[PDB]
Amino acid sequence: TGAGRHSNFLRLSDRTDPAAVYSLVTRTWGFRAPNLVVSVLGGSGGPVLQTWLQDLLRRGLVRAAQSTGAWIVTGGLHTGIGRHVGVAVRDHQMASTGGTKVVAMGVAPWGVVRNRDTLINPKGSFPARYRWVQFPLDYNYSAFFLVDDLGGENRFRLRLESYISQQKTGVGGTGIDIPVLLLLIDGDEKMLTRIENATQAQLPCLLVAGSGGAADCLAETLEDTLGEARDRIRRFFPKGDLEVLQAQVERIMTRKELLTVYSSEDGSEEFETIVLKALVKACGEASAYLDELRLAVAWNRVDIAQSELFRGDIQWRSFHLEASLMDALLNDRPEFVRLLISHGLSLGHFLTPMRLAQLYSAAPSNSLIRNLLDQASVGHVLRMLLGPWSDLLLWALLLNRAQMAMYFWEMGSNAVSSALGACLLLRVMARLEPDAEEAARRKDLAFKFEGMGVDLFGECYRSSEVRAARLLLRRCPLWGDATCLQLAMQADARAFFAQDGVQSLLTQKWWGDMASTTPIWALVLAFFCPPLIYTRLITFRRCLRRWFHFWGAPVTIFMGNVVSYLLFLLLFSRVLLVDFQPAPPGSLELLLYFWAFTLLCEELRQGLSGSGGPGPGHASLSQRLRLYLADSWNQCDLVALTCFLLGVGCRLTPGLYHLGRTVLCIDFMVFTVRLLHIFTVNKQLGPKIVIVSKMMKDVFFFLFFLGVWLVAYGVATEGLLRPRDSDFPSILRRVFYRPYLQIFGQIPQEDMDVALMEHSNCSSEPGFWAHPPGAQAGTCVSQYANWLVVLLLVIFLLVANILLVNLLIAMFSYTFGKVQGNSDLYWKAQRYRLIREFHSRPALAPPFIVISHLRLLLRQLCREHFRVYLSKEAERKLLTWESVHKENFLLARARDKRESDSERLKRTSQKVDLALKQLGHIREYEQRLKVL
Amino acid sequence: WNRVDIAQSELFRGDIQWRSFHLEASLMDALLNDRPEFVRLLISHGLSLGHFLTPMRLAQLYSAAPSNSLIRNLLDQAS
Amino acid sequence: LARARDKRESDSERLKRTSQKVDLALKQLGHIREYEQRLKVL
C-alpha cells in the first residue's frame, strides 16, 4: 500500500522495523521530528466520553500539540479513543483558525478497516480516496500505520515508541532523547497489561484521574503508597481472573515513578506543565539528564522556560544551564538565548572550543557554509575559521542567524566596529554565496547592522565629538590592525559615511592638524606665503613638525595638486598657443614633456600602489592594474596621457606635424576636463560634479530626439531648396550643422528664404532659382515651394527650440529631484576614498614629484593607513565609555519599544487574555457552589 | 439565519458527528444565499468538492442568479 | 498564511480582538454579579 485520501498510510507487519518506519516518517513524506509524542490509549464502551475529558482533549491536549509539535499516536478507527481524539483535532483546527495543522498518527491494524480499497499494489503511490467488528479509518489523522498481523498492533507500537524514545532531538542528532508518554484514558483488562510493557520499556504513563476502568483502578493505587486492593479492583472490573489483575498492578508499581496521575480538575491549562512534571520524575538519575529546562527549549515554548527558571525552587547549577544554551543555539531559538544570558552564563567556561566546533557542526548540509568549510577543510576568514561574544557573534553571521547575531552584537564589546564588521562580512559573504534566495536575507541583515552602527555612532558623536572621533581611528586589533573608517570603506557602508558625525570627522581628517574650521582664503594666503604659516592665521591643534603638519595635510596636498595642475594647463596652453612652431621643441615645450612624464610617473604610483572585490595587498598585478583601469578617472587620466604621447610622437616626426598639433589641442581638452575630477573632493562643488553625469541619460534622449528631427528637418529643407553646390561635405552641413545652429539663434533667413534674397536668375535648369548670399548655402537654391521651407523652419524652431529644449529642462528638473538624495549619499561615501587618496600622495606636486620619486627609488636601493596612537589604558577608557553608551542606547530603544502603541496593544490583549484565563476560574465557582 | 457564531459552535462542539449530506446541503444555502463567511467554515472542515460539484448543483447555483441582472438575461440570450 | 498573520497581528484587529474579549469578560462577569442573588438566597 501507499498514501491516499492528504494522509500517508501503509500496511506493514509486526516484526518489521523500529527504524525504517520512523525514517519513512521523517525522511520520506517528512512531517518533522517531534518534540514529544503523546500516545493515547483507552477506549470507551461505545458512547460519548464525559464533557471534561472531551475538554481535556479539546484544548488541553491538542493545545499542547500545536504548541510543541507533538504528534499523537492513537488507534485510527472512528469508534475507539481515536474517535474522541479525532473529535478534538477536528475541533481545534477550526477553533484556532490560524493553527499549525496538528499531526496525529493513527496506528491501526489492517484486519479491522472494512472499506479497504486495497491500495495500488504497484509500489503504493495512489492518491486513492477512501469510501467513508469492522471499524473504518478516520479522515482526521495525518497518517495511518496499518498493521497486518485488535491485538497485533500493540506489540508494534511499544516496539515503535521505544525506538522513538531512543531517537535524539535537535538539529544534528544531538540534544535530548525525545519524550514519549502514554496517555491513559480509561480502558479494560487489556489496557492494564498494555501499560505494564510500557514500564518495561520505560515509558512515563500519564493516567488521568476521574476517568474510569483502567485509569481510576490505577489512580487509586498510586495515591495508595506507603487486602483492600482486592476490593477496589473489583469496583472497576466485574470480569473475572482478579488474581493476576491484582498481581500485575504491583509489577507496574515496582516502577511506580515512570507513572504519574493527571489530577482531575487540577490541569487542562497546567497540562503542559504536568506533562513536563512526569518527565522529570521519569528522568529522575540515569537517562541522559533531561534537566527540565533543556526540555522546554526543545519544545520551543518560552513561557514554560521562564517560569521554570524564575520560579520553582530556583537552584539552577552550572551544567544545568550549560547544555541548555547549546540546544538554544543548535536549534535556532534566539529568544531562549536572551533568557539564559539574562540569568547569566560563564561565556569563558561556556565558549570552550569543542562547543564552538559543536556549534559549527550543526550547520545545514546543503548550505553555502558547510561545503565552504569542507572546501576550506573574506577568503582569509576560511583560513582563519576552523572547527566571549565576538566568536559567538561571528558564528551567527556565518550561518545567517539573524536574531542571534542581532543579540550577540548587543552583549559584546566593540559595538561600532562589529556593526561595521558585520556589514563587512555579509556583503562579502553574499558575493561568496552561490544562490541568491538566501542572499536576500544575507543583505537585509547587513542593513540591520548598518542601522545600528549609524544609530549608535550618532549617539556617541553627539555625546563627545572628540571621543567619538577616536572611535573610528582606533587601531582595531581585529583584521590585522584595521580602522573603523577602513572597515566602513571595505563594507561599502554608504549609510555610515552619510551621517553628519563621520562627515564632520572627514573634514578634520581633510584639514589634518590644521583646525578644520579654518577659512579657505587663509589657506590660499598661507600657500603663497609660507612665512604666513606661523602667524595669527590658521590655527593648529619644534618648528619642523609645524612645517610638516601644513604641507602634509590633505588640503594642502590637494591645493598643491591644484596649483601645479593649473600651471600645467597654463604651460600646456602657452606651448599650444604661442610656442608650437614646426621647429624642434624649445624651452617650455620640453618642460611640458617632462611635466607630463611626471604626470605619468604619478599615474603609475596609483597603478602599482592601489572590499567589494579583492583584499588589500593582492600583489598580483592582474587585480591591481585591473582595478586601476576601472576607475572612470584613470580612464580619463590615461586617455589624456596616451594622446599626449601620440601628440608628441606625431609632433617630433616631420611629416605629421599638423596632426600632432591637432591631437594636442584635443589633449588639452581632456586634461582640462580632469579639472572636474580634482574638484569633486570639494564640499561645495563636488556633490554637483557627481550630478552632471546622472544627467547624461537625458542629454542622450535629447540628442536622440533632436538628431532624428535634425535629419527630418535637414534633408527636407535641403531637398526642397535644391542647392547647386551639393557636395557631400556641404550637403551634410546644410542638413546637420546649419539646422543645429538654429537651436542657438543662428537662423540664416537670407540663405533659406528666397523672398530675402535677390538675383533670381542663377541656373539654366528649368524652374525658378535664387542666389543665397551665404558661402556654404549653395550657389543657387530653388524657389519652388519656399513657402514650405519657411513653414518647415517654423515647425523646426517649435519642436527643437521650444518643445525639445524646454522638455529637456523638465527632464533635468525631474531627475535632479530623484538623484539629489542618492548621489549626495554616494558622494559622502566617495569622499573618504578621496581624502586618503591625497593623504597617501606625496607632498610634492607633479613637476617637483621627481624629487619624491628619486627619494622613493633611492629608498629601495638602500634596503593612507590612518590610525591615531594612544595608550592602552586610555584606550580601554574609550571602550568602557562606549559600552556604557551601547547599554544606554539598547535600553532606550527597549523602552521606546515597550511604550509603543503596538506593544501596549499586545500587552493589553495578553492581560485581558490573562483576565479571562483567571475569570474562567471564577466561573467554575458556580460548580463550587452547586456542590455546596 | 446569517449568524456565524452559532454555526461554528455547532460544528466545533456539541457531539461532533457531522456526516456527508449534513454538510452538503448546508454549503448550498451558504452559496445560494450569498454568505461567504459560512463558506470558508465548511471548506475548513472539509467537503468533497468532487462529490459536491455535481453538475446539477452548478446549474442549481446558476439558477439563483437574480432575474434583473446582466447575467440571467445574458444566459437567456445565450439559451 | 503570511497575509493572514499580518492581518491578525495588525493593530486594528487586536483592537477588535481585545474589545471582543472585554465583551467576553463582561458577559462572563455578569454571571458573577448574579452571585449576589445566589448568596441572597443563601
Ligand SMILES: CC(C)CCC[C@@H](C)[C@H]1CC[C@H]2[C@@H]3CC=C4C[C@@H](OC(=O)CCC(=O)O)CC[C@]4(C)[C@H]3CC[C@]12C
Ligand atoms: C591657469 C591659471 C588659473 C594659473 C594659476 C594661477 C595661480 C597662481 C593662482 C591664482 C589664484 C589661485 C587659486 C585661489 C583660490 C584656491 C582654492 C583652493 O580650494 C581648496 O583647496 C580648498 C577647498 C576644499 O576644501 O576642497 C584650490 C586652489 C585655488 C583655486 C587657487 C588655485 C591657483 C590659483 C588660481
Ligand SMILES: CC(C)CCC[C@@H](C)[C@H]1CC[C@H]2[C@@H]3CC=C4C[C@@H](OC(=O)CCC(=O)O)CC[C@]4(C)[C@H]3CC[C@]12C
Ligand atoms: C553628436 C555630436 C554632438 C558628438 C557627441 C559628443 C558628446 C556625446 C560628448 C563629447 C564630449 C562630452 C562631454 C565632455 C565633458 C563631460 C563631463 C562629465 O562630468 C564628469 O566627468 C564628472 C566625473 C564623474 O561624475 O564621474 C559629464 C559629461 C560631459 C559634460 C560630456 C557630455 C557629452 C559629450 C558632449
Ligand SMILES: CC(C)CCC[C@@H](C)[C@H]1CC[C@H]2[C@@H]3CC=C4C[C@@H](OC(=O)CCC(=O)O)CC[C@]4(C)[C@H]3CC[C@]12C
Ligand atoms: C548634435 C546631434 C543632434 C547631431 C548633430 C551632428 C552635426 C552637428 C555634426 C555631424 C556631421 C558633422 C560635419 C560633417 C561634414 C562638415 C563639412 C566641413 O566643411 C568642409 O568641407 C571642410 C573640410 C571637410 O570636412 O571636408 C566642415 C565640418 C562639417 C560641418 C562637420 C561638423 C558638424 C557636423 C555637421
Ligand SMILES: [Ca+2]
Ligand atoms: Ca588617477
